[PDB]
Structure formats: structure tokens, C-alpha cells
Design an enzyme around this catalytic site. Structure first.
Site, PDB file in Angstrom:
ATOM      1  CB  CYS A  37      -4.958   0.405   5.408  1.00  0.00           C
ATOM      2  SG  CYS A  37      -4.764   0.640   3.579  1.00  0.00           S
TER       3      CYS A  37
ATOM      4  CG  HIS B  50      -0.625  -0.944   5.984  1.00  0.00           C
ATOM      5  ND1 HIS B  50      -0.630   0.500   6.726  1.00  0.00           N
ATOM      6  CD2 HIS B  50      -1.264  -0.658   4.976  1.00  0.00           C
ATOM      7  CE1 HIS B  50      -1.127   1.288   5.887  1.00  0.00           C
ATOM      8  NE2 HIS B  50      -1.538   0.885   4.992  1.00  0.00           N
TER       9      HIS B  50
ATOM     10  NE  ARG C 166       1.973   4.946   9.915  1.00  0.00           N
ATOM     11  CZ  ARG C 166       0.962   4.454   9.884  1.00  0.00           C
ATOM     12  NH1 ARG C 166       0.326   4.353   8.485  1.00  0.00           N
ATOM     13  NH2 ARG C 166       0.227   4.247  10.886  1.00  0.00           N
TER      14      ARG C 166
ATOM     15  CG  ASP D 298      -2.130   4.412   3.333  1.00  0.00           C
ATOM     16  OD1 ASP D 298      -2.142   3.255   4.119  1.00  0.00           O
ATOM     17  OD2 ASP D 298      -3.245   4.392   2.705  1.00  0.00           O
TER      18      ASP D 298
ATOM     19  CB  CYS E   1      -1.121   0.178   1.274  1.00  0.00           C
ATOM     20  SG  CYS E   1      -1.854   1.458   1.119  1.00  0.00           S
TER      21      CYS E   1
HETATM   22 ZN   LIG Z   1      -2.813   1.736   3.332  1.00  0.00          ZN
END
Ligand SMILES: [Zn+2]
Ligand SMILES: [Zn+2]
Ligand SMILES: [Zn+2]
Ligand SMILES: [Zn+2]
Lengths: 211, 211, 211, 211
Positions: D102, D99, D47, D45, D43
Site C-alpha cells: 500500500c 493490501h 490495483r 491505490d 484503498c
Molecule cells: Zn493502498
């Protein structure tokens, strides 16, 4: 206004009946499927069906229609239809037909936030930029707009030629050939832009020559 | 076979002439544009134009046609046309029209490598899986295939209802309403699947209720 | 070779443990989310993560990676991520980072049938054609290839600037600003292509000037 | 705040220098390319980079990252990367890694107009509806949200299995195998959802069994 739609079904039965009246084997002919000879890529906001404009018989044209008759390389919708028409239907002709007065082209040229439409119409703005010098030189706005409609047809034809399906089939078979036409709602006439198909292919082949 | 295409232009002039013969203001009517009342989403391999099937007047339908009349959420082509038809054309009706004998549905059901077509036809296989129990129960293959055509129309209607444009407009205005129809090349008749539009919307709203 | 993957979980625990060893609040910092300052658009076949190359902290970069770091206007994947980063995350920077030795660029330049990859790599061939004169003039092939990598970064930056989100935010806020960089696996250095952001925007605005 | 970015270049040189300090052949190793063993779909976003989380070496992972780690059948971006990784890179593993926490999943679950993001996040809402009974039964909202993250990983794994590339390679070679994992920013641990790869494939094969 609940009735308006139930009317569509009565008009459908009427059309079916007269078509049998006009020809008894009309729906018998319709049923036994010979592959289309044409893939037609036209605009969603054009007003007359290809089959009408051209005098083509039902089933003779496999039809894709989208806003401003675009052939975008990351659009699976159109790419998969070109692939399918060329490779599996063995279409002999691919026509990109634009039309004067096109709402999509005009809307592309309006500098506003149209949400989801923005990246779609961006393609048309890309066509403008590709011919910016020629287009900007045209003083009259409507004349400029008609020229843009024409250049868009030409550029979308170029995008059809880039496809692997088209090039492979053409190498092997000499078909399909590609046409760029423009319909004119004012007089009902189709015009051939006389897209130079062979030279487009040669230009594209400078870095993408396949067997 | 160089002549075949130059023939399309003669048939075009013939069609224009008779249409003026049939009605002198035909191309005058065509020119002054009232927005379409319908967005029609139909299949590229259907053989008769919507305008014929329905008796609708030219310009009354804004038309998108793709393989198997799909409404895919990551397809900008169709999404941008729904957005544009609902928000900017203020269409009163959106129809998804499938058709029996659909080549795209049949090809979706063939377990082969069709290249670029694979992820497109996958959507249809997804429809099958959504109704796997009902479909597998149907013994006859053709009956199963027709049922799949129908369920595909229903599912693509559901996908139109998920759009923000549709929901916002419907909340505010009570239009557009959505129809799922299926054309039958054997008798020329349109059939209404009587898609329960209000309940689809309520089901979708359980996690996506907008204002 | 069944064991190789179960090893990934042991290496994960080891990494977690040492990161706590290196810093006790490491996973406490990670949890409280400050929005990323950057949207990073990079290539899937680049070998070092942006966070490493740049020294950026975890969560500082929102990352999209695709083959050859393309920003295609009908690709909802990237378009929706630009929209989301600019409008909802309020990213201050958007970087398109290419890299020398890029496999996707090289594969774009190979005249072969790569199936599904064909329309994706076509975008890169389009970049070549946009700079055909300059590129063809470069005698050495590798030098030409590196120049293509660079021009691709520049063109994908131009495509980010065309977005409504970017233009609106920039007008209103003066951010995000756009950077075109290229990573060099040979010496590990990032290079700035010094993309002239303001002039790109002015050129695009000739037909698409919004408020 | 003009300085902040020129700082990224100093941090890059610092990282390059220490990496040579840590290992003199670091950039020599980097240069000679062995194909990645993994395709990682993660994804935008999340980290921490996959390479960090997993302890994988640079170049070992070919990485696609998008909002909520989706594998959409009409998304050429991801489809072309799966095709390329399986067929041309001969990746041994494909991992979909979601994750917890999310942002994309959470935003999918917010009933608002997010413009371009709407049809992208719709896919996640589709995952919810596929498991509506199980999800609605979960009283706690955060627990529901985590479960949705997990089911999304499972469904995107199913979508990878539908690909022709994956099935053909698996039939012929026994690879790639598919994994569904979820990263937890709270403790830094990767968790295996133990996606039953063989049974997913069998279910999909009921109507799409290829050779
Ligand atoms: Zn995400
Ligand atoms: Zn038009
Ligand atoms: Zn059909
Ligand atoms: Zn690359």
C-alpha cells in the site's frame, strides 16, 4: 520571553477577584446552568467576544468561531454544533455574525497557494461567484470587500436554514429564528442585515420540504 | 417574545458608549491590527470568553471554539485554523483550554444515539479508551469526569503537536509553544495542566521527524 | 447463512488460477508499479468497476468512489486524494464519472430526514439549485433526474478545477486534463459530457489566478 | 497524446459488445436492482477491483475507496456511506480490505511535508503509535510495513464497530458482520485477518452500550 505566560495566571486571579468584588454570587450564578438562548457562529479573527458586543450574560451564548464564520455542509464541527444547539439545547436564536475587515475573507480573495487553508477559503470564493455580477459592478475594492462580508453572512445563514434540525424545530416550535449580523470594529456597532428568514426557508423548501 | 432581540442592539450601543467613556481611543486601538500572540482552542459550551478569563487584550487572541475543544485530524475547520495561526499569523502560543462541567464530555459519556453528534463525541470516547485503566480505577464518577476533561485537554494538545505547521515553526523559531489549561466555573480560576510540550514532540517524532 | 462468506475465498482462488491460466506474468506485471495515468472519481452505488467499463489495465486507475461522485471542498478524503494523484502520482487525467439511475442523486431528491446522509446529499440539492430554472423546466421527472446526474458531474468537475494542485500542474505541464462522463447501466455505454475544461478554468481564474 | 482518451470509448463499446456476447441479459440483469449484500471499504491505490478479487456479481458490492482504506470518525464521506449501507441498503457484510505494498501506508511512514495529505496520513501514524511496542520489535522494515497494513485493517474495522448504525443493526438483526481482509498483489490471494468481531464490540460497549 518566558514570563509573559505566567502573567496570564495573575491576570486571571485579578479578574476572578474583581468579579466577586463586582458581584458575590457571580460564580454561584455561573454554576447553575440554564441552557443558552443563542447559538452564535462568529469569526476566529474578530476581536471582541460576542458576549461583550451584545451585552449577553455568561452562558446565554453557545459559541462556535471559525475562519470567516462559515457554515459548510461537510464540516462536522459546525454541523454537529448546529444539531446540538437546536435539538438538545433548544436554542431560540441562531446568529451568524460576520465582521468588516475580516482577514479570512480578504485572504480568500488573494490568489495564492495557502496550503490547507485553500479548500476552506474556497467557500468564500464560492460566495463571490454566487453574486459575481453584483460584486464586480462595485468599483471600489473596499466597498466590494464589505459587500462580500455581508453576502457571506447571508449565504451562511442560508446554509443554516438547509439543516434538517433547523427546519424540523421551526415547523414544530416556531424557533430558532436565524439572524445575520455584521460587527464593525470602527464604531463598535452591530448591524442587522435583516436576513429574510421566512423566504429563504421557502426557497430551500422547493425540493426539501420536510415534516 | 419578538422584543428580546431588538434589545441586543440597544445593549450593543450602550456597550460601545461606555467603552468610549472608559477609553476614547478604544475603537481607534481596535482598528490598527497587530497580529494575535495566541491561538486559543476552547469549548463552545464554556461560559466566559477567553479574553475575560485571561485578561488578554482584544485582538490578542485568535479564537476557535467547538464542542469539547477537540483537535481532530480530519477536521479541516480546526486544521486550517492551526495552519493559518502558526504560518500566517505567527502566533507565539497555542492554548487548548478545557473546562470542568463540560457538557460535551458528559454527553460523550452517555450511551445514546445523538445523530450527527455521534462521530464528533466519538473522539472523546477515544480519549477515554486511551486511558481506560487510569480512568476506570477512579471510583467517584465526577472525579472520573474531571480527569477525563483533563486528559482530553492533554490529548488535543498532542494532536496540535502532530501538525506539520507546528513542528516546522518550532524547529525553525522555537515558537509557538503549546499549553493545556482547564477553566473552573466554580472559582473562576485557570489551571495549568503543565503539558510537557518537549517530550510530547519527541514521542511523536519517533516516526514523524521533519526538517 | 454462515457459509456465504467462506465462498468468497474459493472464488478468489479460482479467479487467481484462471488469471494465471489467461496470462502467466499476470501477477508479475501487477507487482512492478507504474503510476496510474488516471484519477477516477466515481459513485459507490455504480455497479461495474471503472476498469471494466473503460478497458483500463490494473494499476492504470487510482480510484475514489463515494455517494454520488462528489468533490466537496471541505472533504479531506477526496481533496487529499486529488492532491496526491496530481502532485505525487502525476496523473494525466482526472475523470468524474456519474451514472444514470444513481441512488444517491435520487435519495438527495427525497425530502426526508436521512440523518448523517443529510449534509452529504445536501451538496446534490445545491447542484439542483444552481440550475433550478433549467431543471424545473423539464416536465418529465426521470428526464429531470438524468439531467441532474449530468449537471452534478459538470459541477463536480468544476470543483476539481478549483483545486490549487490542478491549476498549478496544468499551468506548468498542460496536465491533468479533466473529463466528465456518465455511465448508462441500460446499454453499458460511457458517454462524454464534453466538459469544456479550458473555459471552466478561465471562469474560476477571475478571482483565483495563480502561478 | 490527444488520441489516448478517445480510445477509452472504443474499449468501452468493445467491452459492452462482448458482455452481450458472453450473456444476452447482462444489461437486463444490471438494470433490475437488488440491494448490495456488501459494503466494501478499500484503498484507492489497490490495483484490482473488489468485484474481480472476490468473484462478486455487479451490484453485489457497494464500494468506497480512499487512501489506505481509512474509516475516520470526522470524515462525513465514509461515515455517511456506512450509515447509508447499514440503515438504508441493509448490507449483510462490511469488509475493510487493505493490501500489501500500500502506497498510502508507506507514504504515511515517510517523515515529510505532504501538504493536504498530512492530516489524512496522520491517521495511519496513529495506528502505528497504538501498536508501537509490537511494531518497533519487528526488525525487518518490510515485515514491519506488512504488519502495519494488517493492524490498520484491524483498527479501521474497530472504527466501523463504533458507529451507532452498526451497533443498532447488529443488536436488532445480527447483521452486518464485519470482516478485515488483506489482498496480496504478489499471488492474487485474499487473506482473512480473522477480526474477532464480537470481542471488539464488547470492548467498545464498556462506555457506549446502546439499545
Ligand atoms: Zn493502498
Ligand atoms: Zn474574520
Ligand atoms: Zn465544554
Ligand atoms: Zn450513484
Amino acid at each position: 520571553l518566558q514570563e509573559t505566560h505566567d502573567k496570564v495566571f495573575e491576570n486571571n486571579k485579578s479578574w476572578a477577584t474583581e468579579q466577586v468584588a463586582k458581584d458575590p454570587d457571580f460564580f454561584k450564578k455561573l454554576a447553575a446552568g440554564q441552557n443558552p438562548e443563542y447559538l452564535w457562529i462568529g469569526c476566529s479573527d474578530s476581536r471582541i467576544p460576542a458576549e461583550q458586543i451584545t451585552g449577553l450574560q455568561p452562558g446565554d451564548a453557545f459559541v462556535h468561531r471559525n475562519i470567516a464564520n462559515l457554515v459548510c455542509n461537510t464540516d462536522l464541527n459546525v454541523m454537529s454544533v448546529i444539531e446540538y444547539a437546536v435539538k438538545h439545547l433548544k436554542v431560540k436564536h441562531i446568529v451568524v455574525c460576520g465582521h468588516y475587515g475580516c482577514g479570512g475573507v480578504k485572504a480568500a480573495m488573494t490568489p495564492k497557494d495557502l496550503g490547507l487553508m485553500n479548500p476552506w477559503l474556497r467557500n468564500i470564493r464560492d460566495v463571490y461567484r454566487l453574486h459575481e455580477k453584483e460584486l464586480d459592478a462595485i468599483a471600489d475594492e473596499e466597498a466590494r470587500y464589505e459587500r462580500l462580508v455581508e453576502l457571506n453572512v447571508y449565504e451562511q445563514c442560508r446554509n443554516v436554514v438547509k439543516t434538517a434540525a433547523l427546519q424540523q424545530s421551526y415547523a414544530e416550535n416556531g424557533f430558532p429564528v436565524i439572524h445575520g449580523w455584521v460587527f464593525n470594529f470602527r464604531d463598535g456597532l452591530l448591524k442587522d442585515l435583516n436576513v429574510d428568514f421566512e423566504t429563504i426557508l421557502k426557497d430551500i423548501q422547493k425540493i426539501y420540504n420536510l415534516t
